[PDB]
Amino acid sequence: SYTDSYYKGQTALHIAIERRNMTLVTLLVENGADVQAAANGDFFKKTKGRPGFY
Amino acid sequence: SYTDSYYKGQTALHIAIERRNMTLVTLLVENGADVQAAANGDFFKKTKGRPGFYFGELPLSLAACTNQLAIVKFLLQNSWQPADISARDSVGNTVLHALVEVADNTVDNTKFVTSMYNEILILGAKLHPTLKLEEITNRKGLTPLALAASSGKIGVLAYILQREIHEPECRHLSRKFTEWAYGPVHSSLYDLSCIDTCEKNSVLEVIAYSSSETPNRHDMLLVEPLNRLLQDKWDRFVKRIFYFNFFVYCLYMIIFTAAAYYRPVEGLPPYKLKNTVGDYFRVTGEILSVSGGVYFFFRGIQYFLQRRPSLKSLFVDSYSEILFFVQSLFMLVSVVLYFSQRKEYVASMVFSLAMGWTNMLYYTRGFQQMGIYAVMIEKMILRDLCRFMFVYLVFLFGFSTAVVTLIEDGKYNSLYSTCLELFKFTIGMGDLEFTENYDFKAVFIILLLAYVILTYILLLNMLIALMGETVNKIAQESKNIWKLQRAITILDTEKSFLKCMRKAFRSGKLLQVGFTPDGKDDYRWCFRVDEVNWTT
Numbered sequence: 001s002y003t004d005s006y007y008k009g010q011t012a013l014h015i016a017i018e019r020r021n022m023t024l025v026t027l028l029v030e031n032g033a034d035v036q037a038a039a040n041g042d043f044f045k046k047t048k049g050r051p052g053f054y
Numbered sequence: 055s056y057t058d059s060y061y062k063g064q065t066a067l068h069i070a071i072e073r074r075n076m077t078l079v080t081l082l083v084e085n086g087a088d089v090q091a092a093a094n095g096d097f098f099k100k101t102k103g104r105p106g107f108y109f110g111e112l113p114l115s116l117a118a119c120t121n122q123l124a125i126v127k128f129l130l131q132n133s134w135q136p137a138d139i140s141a142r143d144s145v146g147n148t149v150l151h152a153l154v155e156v157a158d159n160t161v162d163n164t165k166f167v168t169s170m171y172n173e174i175l176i177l178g179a180k181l182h183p184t185l186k187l188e189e190i191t192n193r194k195g196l197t198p199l200a201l202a203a204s205s206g207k208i209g210v211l212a213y214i215l216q217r218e219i220h221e222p223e224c225r226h227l228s229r230k231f232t233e234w235a236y237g238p239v240h241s242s243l244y245d246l247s248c249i250d251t252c253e254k255n256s257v258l259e260v261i262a263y264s265s266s267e268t269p270n271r272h273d274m275l276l277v278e279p280l281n282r283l284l285q286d287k288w289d290r291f292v293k294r295i296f297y298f299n300f301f302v303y304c305l306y307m308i309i310f311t312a313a314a315y316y317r318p319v320e321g322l323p324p325y326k327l328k329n330t331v332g333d334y335f336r337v338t339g340e341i342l343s344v345s346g347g348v349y350f351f352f353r354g355i356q357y358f359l360q361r362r363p364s365l366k367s368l369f370v371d372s373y374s375e376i377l378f379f380v381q382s383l384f385m386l387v388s389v390v391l392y393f394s395q396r397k398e399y400v401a402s403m404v405f406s407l408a409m410g411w412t413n414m415l416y417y418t419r420g421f422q423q424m425g426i427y428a429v430m431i432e433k434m435i436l437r438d439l440c441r442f443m444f445v446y447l448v449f450l451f452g453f454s455t456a457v458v459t460l461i462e463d464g465k466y467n468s469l470y471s472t473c474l475e476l477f478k479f480t481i482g483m484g485d486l487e488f489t490e491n492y493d494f495k496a497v498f499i500i501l502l503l504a505y506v507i508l509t510y511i512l513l514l515n516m517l518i519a520l521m522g523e524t525v526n527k528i529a530q531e532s533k534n535i536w537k538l539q540r541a542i543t544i545l546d547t548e549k550s551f552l553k554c555m556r557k558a559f560r561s562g563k564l565l566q567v568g569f570t571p572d573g574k575d576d577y578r579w580c581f582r583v584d585e586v587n588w589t590t
C-alpha cells in the first residue's frame with residue numbers, strides 16, 4: 001500500500017478497479033484482498049482548493 | 055530564373071513544388087537544380103500593404119508551407135543534393151518560423167501546421183541529433199515559439215507548450231511529460247524553458263508587452279502552463295509585494311495631502327522654517343512629497359526608454375504610465391516655480407494633488423471585481439470623448455460666435471462668458487431667463503432654444519448611448535482583462551524586486567528525460583501540474 005500522507009490507504013484492489021481490470025479484481029479478491037480498506041489520503045478526500053478524486 | 059524586381063530569384067523548382075508535381079521535382083533535383091535558392095522578390099517578401107505570397111523564400115520552406123511532406127522528405131534525404139533543414143531566408147526565418155507565419159488560428163490550418171511541424175522536428179532529430187532548430191532565432195531575435203507568441207497564433211502556441219511524443223529516439227523533443235493518471239486527475243511535468251528565464255525574450259514578456267493588436271492577446275494566457283505559472287507566482291510572493299506597494303502609495307498620498315493643505319499663505323515663496331513643531335513636520339512632508347515625484351519621474355523615463363512605444367500606440371497601451379509621469383511633471387514644475395519665487399507653484403501643486411488621488415485607481419486593476427471600472431474609464435476617455443470633442447466643439451463654437459456677433463453690450467458680448475454659459479446649457483444647468491431689454495430678442499431666443507434642443511437633448515444622449523454601448527461591450531470580457539493585468543503586474547514586480555535575488559523559478563532543476571541523443575542527461579526546470587478533467 002501507499003504509506004505516505006498523500007495516497008494514504010491506496011492498495012492494489014483500488015488500482016485494479018480503477019484500471020477496469022475485471023480479471024485482476026477477481027484474482028485479488030480470491031487471494032484475500034481487503035474489500036473494505038479505506039483510501040483516505042489527501043488526494044482521495046473531499047477538498048476544494050486542490051485537485052483530487054473523491 | 056526571374057531577374058526582375060518583382061519575382062527576383064524565382065526558379066523552376068519553386069514552380070514544380072508550387073504546382074505539386076512530384077515528378078518534375080524529382081527530375082529537377084536529379085539534374086542539379088539548386089535546392090536552396092532564395093526567391094526574395096517583392097511578391098515574395100513578408101508584407102501587409104501589398105498582395106504577395108511569403109513562404110520563407112526557400113524550396114524546403116515552400117514544400118513545408120504548402121502541406122507537401124513527401125517533397126520535404128525527398129529534399130532532405132535525397133543524395134543528389136540534400137537540403138539543409140536549418141537554412142534561413144533573408145529575414146532569418148527557418149522552416150519553423152515560416153510555418154508559424156502561415157498560421158491563421160483556424161481548425162484545419164491548425165491541423166496542417168501542427169502536423170507538419172511535428173513531422174519536421176522528428177525528421178530533424180533523426181538527421182542531425184545534435185541540431186536544435188527550436189533555439190535558432192530569426193533576424194529580430196525571435197525563436198519560433200516567441201514568434202508564435204508575438205503573432206497571437208493560439209493553435210501553434212497551445213500545441214508547442216503541450217507537446218508530447220510517445221516514441222524513443224525523439225522523446226527529448228517533448229515538453230509535456232505525463233507522470234501519472236488517475237480517473238479524473240492526471241499529473242504531468244511541463245518543460246518551462248524560455249517561459250520565465252530566457253534572458254533575451256521570454257513568452258510572458260512577449261504576450262504581456264504586445265501592442266494590443268495581437269488577435270488573441272488575452273486568450274493566450276488561458277493556455278494551461280501559463281495560467282498555472284501566473285497563479286503560482288501570484289500566490290507565492292507577488293501578491294504580498296503588490297499589497298505593500300499599494301499601502302505605501304496610500305501613505306504617500308496622505309502625507310502629500312496633509313502637507314499641501316497646510317501650505318503657508320504669506321507671499322513670495324520660498325518660506326523659511328521657524329523653530330517650531332509644525333514647521334518641522336510640514337517641511338518633512340514637503341521633502342517626502344518631492345522625493346516621491348522624483349521617483350515616479352525616473353520610473354517613467356525608464357519605462358519609456360525600455361519599451362520604446364510608438365506615437366500611434368503611445369496612449370492605447372501605457373495609459374497608466376503616462377498618467378503617473380504627468381503627475382511627476384506637475385510636481386517638478388511646482389518645485390521649479392517654488393524655488394523661482396512665484397506663487398504659481400500652488401497651481402501646479404494642485405493639479406498633481408488631484409492626479410495623485412485618481413491614479414489610485416491603477417491599483418484596482420488586478421482585482422476580478424474592481425478593475426473593470428478603471429478599464430471602462432480608460433476606454434471611454436480614449437475613444438468616445440476624444441472623438442466627440444470635435445463634433446461638440448463645432449457646435450459650441452458655431453452658436454457661441456453667432457450669439458456674440460448678434461449681441462452688443464451685455465454679459466453675452468465676449469467669447470469667454472458666452473462659451474461658458476452655452477456649456478452650462480449643454481449640461482442642463484442654465485437659466486433661460488429671457489428678462490433683459492435688448493434688440494433682436496426673438497432671434498436670440500430662437501438661437502438659444504435651437505442650441506438647447508441640439509446639444510442637451512440630442513447630442514448629449516447620443517454620447518450617453520455610445521458610452522453605454524461601450525460598457526456593455528466589455529461587461530463580458532472581465533475575466534480575461536483581469537488576468538492580463540495580473541500578468542503585467544507580475545512581470546513588473548519581477549523586474550525590479552529590490553533584493554538582488556532572481557528566484558523566479560518554480561520547481562527543481564529536475565532530470566526530465568535523462569537520455570539525450572548523446573550519453574548525457576537533461577535537467578530542464580520542469581514544473582509540475584496536476585490537472586483535472588471530468589470528461590467521461
Ligand SMILES: C=C(C)[C@]12C[C@@H](C)[C@@]34O[C@](Cc5ccccc5)(O[C@@H]1[C@@H]3C=C(COC(=O)Cc1ccc(O)c(OC)c1)C[C@]1(O)C(=O)C(C)=C[C@@H]41)O2
Nearest residue numbers: 374377378380405408409412413415416428429431432435
Ligand atoms: C493625460 C491625460 C490623457 C489626462 C490627464 C489629466 C488632465 C486627466 O484629464 C485628461 C483629459 C480629461 C480632462 C477632463 C475630463 C475628461 C478628460 O484625461 C487624463 C486624466 C484623466 C483622469 C481621469 O481618469 C482616471 O480615472 C484615472 C485613471 C483611470 C484608469 C487608470 O488605469 C489609471 O491608472 C493610472 C488612472 C484624471 C486626471 O488626470 C485628473 O486627475 C485631472 C485633474 C484631470 C484628469 O487628461
Ligand SMILES: CCCCCCCCCCCCCCCC(=O)O[C@H](COC(=O)CCCCCC)COP(=O)(O)OCCN
Nearest residue numbers: 486487488489494495496497498499500501503504507511
Ligand atoms: C422637443 C421638440 C419640440 C420642441 C418645440 C419647442 C417649443 C418651445 C416653445 C417655447 C416658446 C417660448 C417663447 C418665448 C416667449 C417670450 O419670451 O416672449 C416672446 C419674445 O419673442 C420671441 O422670442 C418670439 C417667439 C420665439 C419663437 C419660439 C419658437 C414674445 O414677445 P414678448 O417678449 O413681449 O412676450 C411677452 C411675455 N413675457
Ligand SMILES: CNC[C@H](O)[C@H](O)[C@H](O)[C@H](O)CO
Nearest residue numbers: 478479480481482483484485
Ligand atoms: C435644481 N435646479 C436646477 C439645477 O441646477 C439643474 O440645472 C437641474 O435640476 C438639472 O438639470 C435636473 O437634474
